Amino acid sequence: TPLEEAIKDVDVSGVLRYRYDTGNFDKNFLNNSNLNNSKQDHKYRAQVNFSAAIADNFKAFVQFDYNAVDGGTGVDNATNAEKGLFVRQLYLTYTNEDVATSVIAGKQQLNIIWTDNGVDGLVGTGVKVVNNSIDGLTLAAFAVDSFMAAEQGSDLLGQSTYVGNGKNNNDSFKLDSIGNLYGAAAVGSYDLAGGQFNPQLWLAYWDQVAFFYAVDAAYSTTIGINWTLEGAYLGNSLDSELDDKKTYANGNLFALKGSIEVNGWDASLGGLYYGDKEKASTVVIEDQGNLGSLLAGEEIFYTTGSRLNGDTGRNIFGYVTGGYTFNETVRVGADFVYGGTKTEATTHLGGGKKLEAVARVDYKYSPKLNFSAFYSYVNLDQGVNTNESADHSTVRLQALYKF
Amino acid sequence: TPLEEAIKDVDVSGVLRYRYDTGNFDKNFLNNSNLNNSKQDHKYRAQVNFSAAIADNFKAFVQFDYNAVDGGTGVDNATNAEKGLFVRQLYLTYTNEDVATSVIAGKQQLNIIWTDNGVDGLVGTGVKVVNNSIDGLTLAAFAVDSFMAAEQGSDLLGQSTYVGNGKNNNDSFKLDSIGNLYGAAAVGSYDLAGGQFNPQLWLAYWDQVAFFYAVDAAYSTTIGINWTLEGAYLGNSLDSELDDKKTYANGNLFALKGSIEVNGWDASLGGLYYGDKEKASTVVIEDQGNLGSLLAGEEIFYTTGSRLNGDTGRNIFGYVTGGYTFNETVRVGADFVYGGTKTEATTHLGGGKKLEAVARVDYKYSPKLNFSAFYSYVNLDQGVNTNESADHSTVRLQALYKF
Amino acid sequence: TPLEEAIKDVDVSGVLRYRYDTGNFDKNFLNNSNLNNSKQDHKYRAQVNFSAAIADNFKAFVQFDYNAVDGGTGVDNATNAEKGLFVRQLYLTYTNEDVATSVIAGKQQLNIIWTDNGVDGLVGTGVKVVNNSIDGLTLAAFAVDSFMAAEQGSDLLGQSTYVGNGKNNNDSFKLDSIGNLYGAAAVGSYDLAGGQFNPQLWLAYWDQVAFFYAVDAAYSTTIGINWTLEGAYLGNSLDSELDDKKTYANGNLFALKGSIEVNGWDASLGGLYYGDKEKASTVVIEDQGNLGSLLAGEEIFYTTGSRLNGDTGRNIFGYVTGGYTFNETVRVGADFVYGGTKTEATTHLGGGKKLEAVARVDYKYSPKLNFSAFYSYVNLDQGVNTNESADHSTVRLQALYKF
Ligand SMILES: [Ca+2]
Ligand SMILES: [Ca+2]
Ligand SMILES: [Ca+2]
Ligand SMILES: [Ca+2]
Ligand SMILES: [Ca+2]
Ligand SMILES: [Ca+2]
């Protein structure tokens, strides 16, 4: 078929993202597989998605991914990525409009509350059933048979490590094997008179790991002023393979945030409570799940003992953010996060007071092209040697194009 | 050039195929590199072909292939294919319409009678000359200089193995080296009054291997009943590198099939005779060549001693098939195959009676999109321990889109 | 977005090139990593370039590369390239027309005078600033932070080797490490009354290697006759890491060529002088840089001691070329090159008189599609055993499509 013709049944979207990241560390800082260790690297992430109508009620979707690094520093003057595109997602979508339901089967980015829903979200193979028969309500069941785990490295539960006690790869949350994942979801979006309300309810059973359960709600509204409030609880109870190890513990997390917009000024205040002093627990499956609206900073929740994807210790944190937006074009702003981790100091690492300040610029050049930067300073009250404390700077420049 | 413009000299076609295969085996079953060993794997095979008019009388062709597997079972919950596209075919086509002839040079899927002509057909580099000056007759010469062997694994002659005698990789047909391939073909398609007649004659010399020669003919009829009859002989005589090894033997194969269609019922009866009791011989070069219309079942001709691409043993098999077709849309049907292999029990394995039954569903959703499934049960009268017999089940679900 | 739409902001170009090369050698020939050692190989090089307008003043560019080989001979009857596309260039271009300047940042083919500017040109990551404010003058500064070195193999300075003294990998120019590259360029194109004048001036500092400096000028003109004259000097002075090794030496090269066109006849005469009798020096960074207009033959400047990208020995060569062009369509022509290398015979290899004759056909089938061939015979007055001399033939057939 003439390509001119073939492309008419096709839709394209994607992402092009560049990153110049440099992360530094005091010798006393508790480093691990999740903190930013870039050394003036140029990083590329490109994704191109094609969706094609292939028959009545059937679309096919593919995503191509380019994930590559070029060096700057030292011997990295020869590191220059010679890489190709990889098929990252490949799946079929049956849609029946009469019953406002879709079946999506294949290798797909999961986009559940316990995984990143953006560029680097966990991908697996399985089936998703999604219903929109009710006004303002999305109902879904899903089953995953396998996970694209290698690509995710230390983003995935059970694949994070940390430094300490003369070993670079102490396992943050040992997971000897994994099963299939089964779950469901209800996700509401409603116009009250006052404004929009977004409740969410998530259940899943990950065989050999845990039964997860979560609720999250957001209210948002007008008056020229805008304010949102958002809360969430995520908990899980362990499967018996972990329960019998004795050194794991059912997860709990509480988080709340409120925020304000007026005249270009924006600000937010929020906090959260999670983990267990003595035993390993997790909040999410991959990275920080879909909880970004209930977080702040960049690095602080990657410190040892404070990671949301497996770690040991009890965490309390509060944060504030603020920024001004010149002409709806450039935003200068900052984040401040403060809190701590409690551990059993005899057996586990990362306990103590922690803080982070972040300065930010976000420049909206066009509706599709943004440039952004941040400077993050993180301080640990007690480092490798717990008597002294420890610094960790991270600087990023970023270009990001969406299409 | 604007891409909009550039694509006007371009033509696209391809394939998307999904497969959920699970193959199981009695501990007593004779396993080898060709039987189905899938363990609830999701298998993707995608091909996209672009053909561009580059100048007067010249087209260029490329094919991109994605061949990947995702796990289901056990430790395969982490196996999830992180693969890219590979250039599978790249060739030039000179066409002169005045002499109804085309010259096709490059890396190309061979599509000769001794290779699979479908998705997973053997690819090599060489030249093809094809003529359509005579009404209803296609004439061709061809020469191949190299073969895309690795991709084919055990589908290729000389690269199959089998289990037995405490060794997992007993070579089915040892081929220490290979030469170039040269051959020709005549392929007729004629409307007699009664109906269509399709004679074929194929010759080739594969240096260091064998001289192949084949004839195949099919008659089919029109209108409310329909019937086809199809026969074939494939033989080869060995090159002296194999003749002097003493343990090889010129190949012969005879096959015949007849079949009936009426009111949605269809049925077929057929049989075949091939191989040699004492010595290794082959029928085809890759997999089961283009002989699918003269076969039945799924697994039976992959049992040790019965493979069409190198094996020792003499084979006689008969088969019957049957099915009903609700609305020209869904076909439920079955295959029964029965026969045996005769060997020298002292020196070689796989001798004995063999059967296979297969249940089938074939659902034509659209002209481009088909879903199919099958359940195959294969029985070996004499297994690893030849005293007891042995089972082998295999189940497949399949989606297949052509464009 | 509908793809139909998305492709309107896009521009495509590229190259498809096929090569059947076979290079042979006397047992007495001095072989190395740069002479042609093909054995009836089919070679493919494809590049496809997409440039997209992404916002006001911003384009993005990507290049995909396919670089692959299929065998012919012996065991190479199984070598058949199973390769994919790789992202070879990925870069952003900011263009401000008000100041006739462009900033091009990313992974890009450098196209400086010291690298190949064609299909296989050295790629690195960095920034290029280019100005066209002056009539007939292009001004540029550039900085490179890393190099795509692996892809270039022995084309890159410091990665060539040679055979001799019972060792196959004697290093032609040992470079233990490399720094960043910084340079600038001025490139003129002017219509004098007589005809066009093309001066060029190139400076760069490659940290840990050398400071390079170059001038090149070309005059061309009418009188139905056409004649060009072109000269160049390339020199470099070493960085102290090489100066202190004592066995390296600042590079100098002089070259001059004049040439004639009339009635389909064309001819050229030229010569050059480079290198150092006792010590390793280089002229260019990758392959033969952009100096092809000042060279002739195919193989002779790849002989040991005569390579433009790192070698020991002093070289003088002269050459003549000539050809006739039937109908602006087919050119039959030849090259003759003659000269020598002076070395310290005690310590280094490749010294002696050398010649090359090349017969050529170049068939312009369309403005986009060319077929070409050459036969090259190279003779070394003194080979491995320096008493006897040594032959090296090289034959190429080539198809080359540009779009
Ligand atoms: Ca991730
Ligand atoms: Ca599974
Ligand atoms: Ca195959
Ligand atoms: Ca060959
Ligand atoms: Ca090169
Ligand atoms: Ca650098």
Numbering used by the authors:
A (entry chain A), B (entry chain B), C (entry chain C): 1 to 223, 226 to 405
Task: Show the paper's wording.
MOMP is an 18-stranded antiparallel β-barrel porin with an elliptical shape common to other 18-stranded porins. Unusually for an 18-stranded β-barrel, MOMP adopts the same trimeric arrangement as seen for OmpF and OmpC, which are 16-stranded β-barrels. The most striking difference between MOMP and OmpF/OmpC from E. coli is the presence of a Ca2 +-binding site in the constriction zone of MOMP.
The protein purified from Campylobacter (nMOMP) was solved via molecular replacement using the recombinant MOMP structure as a search model. In the protein purified from Campylobacter, the helix is also present and adopts the same organization but lacks the short strand seen in the overexpressed recombinant protein. The protein purified from Campylobacter was crystallized in the presence of Ca2 + ions and has an ion in an identical position but also has a second ion located outside the barrel at the interface between subunits. The recombinant structure shows a different side-chain conformation, implying that in the recombinant protein, this site does not exist. The identical trimeric arrangement is found in the protein purified from Campylobacter; in this case, the trimer is found in the crystallographic asymmetric unit. We detected no difference in structure or function between the MOMP purified from C. jejuni and the MOMP heterologously expressed in E. coli.
